[PDB]
């Protein structure tokens, strides 16, 4: 028998220390990484459950393993809630990640060497979008699949183009999934043949992937087999349960309010950067372009980190520097807003970031500025705790 | 702020019901599915941690995101412990699953159109090492795939002869290898993969191991990321770290032999009762002689709270890793197999089947109560 009191702290203190350190880090650092969030304790509760013990290859009611009667309920809930949230006729909640969701779509709908028009295969690219040009490329190259993703993207126009040349329409709903769930951005599901997203970024759920589709029996069967046995074996049933409860949380009225906060916070930050003379490329994420100031993204993210502001360097369009250096920062506010930072605080935060960037060439002034900003960041982190009682 | 008291039971009673039902089922059903196990509360603690909130593309000390200084400790522990457990010079603990581990190896080592010798242009082969060598020389595989006791050194020799990579999927014997009960392929193969949740008894996920070879290590690094995956599941990687520490305890080797002892005991019981066995921790009960289908056996046994898979051989696939993990001993395993034979005989004889199912159910319930999976 496993004693239920077995724990990491007593057994594996070095590992435990890294965990408690990370917990503390999530409190006392402001996180501006666009692809991160903070998920609810209920999601973590499901991920920490005994459902990890169940092998469940196949789909609810159609498993290759016995004993799946109760995990079928959890998975069905996740599927039904995903369909409800996105007005889909089909949802596949087994993908382990966005990478596996996307791979499965490719395997479902394309054969290697097929042509693919987008933003093993013959790739054609397109670069506000010029739909006239996308259509011209579609007609010229006859893609098997057209991919669109995330201004306001016109899904109905992509459907029109796909229809014209008999292509599948694949939408990667990355970075607008939460806005779509909240009714704040046009839904690609009615227009695409298939839609993917991760479940941990703007949806704020567990780490994993999700496939959605409007009704098409043949495409749905291809998607089924592509996920399993195509890309995966057994799904992570504890993470699927976590997906079920996260999708329930995402349907709450509070979630649309949170999504608007995400947007308002980004707008406040943008207005501060612009007011301080920093160029923005822009939405819940934006780039701070650092060309005018001769600052590298690497240089800026290091300095901001020392001030307990975690951001990622990022190449600007046509960046003259390598991707390991870059001339920009990428900022997103999903995590900022999730921990309750408001638009005014976001505005001030960006101003603190500008104080750092302005001082970055002056060693003494930069040290002085980082010291000051740290104190301000600590006070904000304490005022807006991520988890607690 | 998330209030830390937020819970599933208060908020999502229907999901909670499915979870508490599954927990109870794990107690009151004997699980004989070969590829399942029961992982420790420490693994589950890690999987339920806040490490799920961290994006950490790249590898420790070489991330594409900031803020990874602490999760780097957890992943380095996982890597170091995998290396020490399997005597490898290289360990990649990021694969989300066995499938992802295997897919990364193909991408790292093979090109589209390459030839592959296993058991892409595919050529398939006691093992007949002569024929293996024959086929290798004949078709010049870019990669040979392998996985009683397999002679790893012979595969290395053959692979060397033709200048092929050697890839071992160790998933069926990983626990035995960790326990020193089966020859370790790691010194011989160029790359080894395994799951972490089957005979290793850890979190659900994948693992890649390799002997020192800087060129191959670089290819594997980039095959896993960005080749097959994006961000790793850092909460699950932490769970791998504590699982690998548990796998190094002397208790673990005792457990691995108990798995084998339990299988041997069940097999003797079936044979003694006239049921044909096809055959380490897995075996097949062939039901053709009695004219029992997998479906009706599976159904009857399931009603007696014995969870099996049906299986080509017609009948049951049985494995004992979970059985041994919850403390069922060999004598108990022998009796369990005899109870299963009572049910099977009742089907074939069409006699007292319902009563016999109930009888085995109450015996199974007592065994489950005597050998709880989790408790205080
Ligand atoms: Cl302990
Ligand atoms: Cl609650
Ligand atoms: Cl395993």
From Swiss-Prot, chain A:
GO terms for biological process: glycine biosynthetic process from serine; tetrahydrofolate interconversion. PROSITE patterns: SHMT. It catalyses: (6R)-5,10-methylene-5,6,7,8-tetrahydrofolate + glycine + H2O = (6S)-5,6,7,8-tetrahydrofolate + L-serine. It holds the Pfam family SHMT. It is found in: Cytoplasm. Keywords: Amino-acid biosynthesis, Cytoplasm, One-carbon metabolism, Pyridoxal phosphate, Transferase. Its EC number is 2.1.2.1. Pathway: One-carbon metabolism; tetrahydrofolate interconversion; Amino-acid biosynthesis; glycine biosynthesis; glycine from L-serine: step 1/1. This is Serine hydroxymethyltransferase.
